[PDB]
Amino acid sequence: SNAIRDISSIELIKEMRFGWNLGNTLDAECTSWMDYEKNPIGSETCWGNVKTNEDIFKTLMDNQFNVFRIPTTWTGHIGEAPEYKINEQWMKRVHEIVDYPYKNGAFVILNIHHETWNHAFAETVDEAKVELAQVWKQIAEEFKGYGERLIFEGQNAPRKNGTPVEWNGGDKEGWDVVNAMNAVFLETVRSSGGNNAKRHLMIPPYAAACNENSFKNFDFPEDDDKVIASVHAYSPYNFALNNGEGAVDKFDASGKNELDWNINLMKKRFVDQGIPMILGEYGAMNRDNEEERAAWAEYYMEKITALGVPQVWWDNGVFEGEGERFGLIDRKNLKIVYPSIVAALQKGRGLEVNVLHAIETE
Ligand SMILES: OC[C@H]1O[C@@H](O[C@H]2[C@H](O)[C@@H](O)[C@H](O[C@H]3[C@H](O)[C@@H](O)[C@H](O)O[C@@H]3CO)O[C@@H]2CO)[C@H](O)[C@@H](O)[C@@H]1O
């Protein structure tokens, strides 16, 4: 089945309800202690998530999720330079997981994620561009026959890791590198075989940041209507993403102001300019505050739905402890842990509320 619809991204995006990330899974990176030679697909579970199965996705699809992002870290599974051959058992497992939502008719986003080699520094950009082309040549070849519901996202949050400008929008060095890398990704996939000339491709601004500086220095192609801007927006910060000092457990007036500001940024940079965009990651972590988060999620969803922009929940499988607690589905037991959040996504999207597989009330 190698058919692909010839459809613009803006038209295709209309078919998207809302999404879910298979977080802390194929993106988990454990090369400091795991032997990837003896465990070539072991990294999937090395951050504590269960082995992925189709029923995780069917549980979510029952709740009207129809976009599934598969964040994938290829670092550790890549052969030596300059061929950068991807381990074939790893590629097969990535392929099995893409197929869980894809063969059930949903949208799938496959990316490159926690890579050590695509950092946004001019020092290494010549080498990083070669590795990016080699990696995407192989991904594009493996999935060349897939239709329009399989989307490639060329980079995740390329940035100047470990610098003062890592998380505040970047600087000119970082913007030029991210743009050059995005161009290599687009060219590599467009130049490849099969349906890839008509595949929908996502590219991020620097760090995928919802930021004035990142947005303003983001190059976007003017002659390719099947390219999509990839943005991440865990907004407002202290309520949604702050895992240290200053975190708040209520979505208050100042938090709404901050969220409204960033949504308006997306409107002015992308929506008003006819640039297709997807919020590929967002979420608010568990602070024993499900109703605060449900109200925030319904408001966020309603506002971006009025702009035609879909969003994709970041679910890293973590519910308690010191880590970031973005879990939404209990993958082991196939239960929605926060049913009022899922109800908020449905209601805010304009859908009928029907939360299936909810956990019992304790
Ligand atoms: O517990 C296992 C490891 O967790 C690592 O933290 C991860 C968070 O749990 C996860 O929520 C976060 O998700 C990122 C996403 O990958 C990224 O694309 C986006 O820019 O931000 C999201 C929210 O922060 O990923 C991190 C990994 O970077 C710990 O860092 C690690 O020590 C620990 O072993």
Author numbering: -2 to 359
From the primary publication:
Attempts to crystallize the CelD active catalytic domain with cellobiose or cellotriose substrates were unsuccessful using both soaking and co-crystallization approaches. After introducing the inactivating E154A mutation to the active site of a single CelD catalytic domain, we were able to obtain high-quality crystals of the E154A-cellotriose complex. The unliganded structures of the wild-type catalytic domain and its inactive E154A mutant in complex with cellotriose were determined by molecular replacement and refined to 2.5 Å and 1.8 Å resolution, respectively. Superposition of two structures solved in this work confirms that the carboxylate OE1 and OE2 oxygens of the catalytic acid/base glutamate point towards the O1 atom of the − 1 glucopyranose unit at 1.5 Å and 1.7 Å, respectively, and the carboxylate oxygen of the complementary nucleophile glutamate forms a hydrogen bond with the anomeric C1 carbon of the same saccharide unit at 3.1 Å. Meanwhile, the nucleophile Glu278 is sandwiched between two conserved Arg66 and Tyr231 residues which form hydrogen bonds to the carboxylate oxygens and appear to serve a supportive role to stabilize this Glu residue throughout catalysis as observed for other GH5 enzymes. We found 8 ordered water molecules making multiple hydrogen bonds with both the protein moiety and the cellotriose molecule in the ligand-bound structure; two of them are located near the anomeric carbon of the − 1 saccharide moiety. One of these water molecules may participate in the catalytic mechanism of the CelD as a nucleophilic attack on the glycosyl-enzyme intermediate.
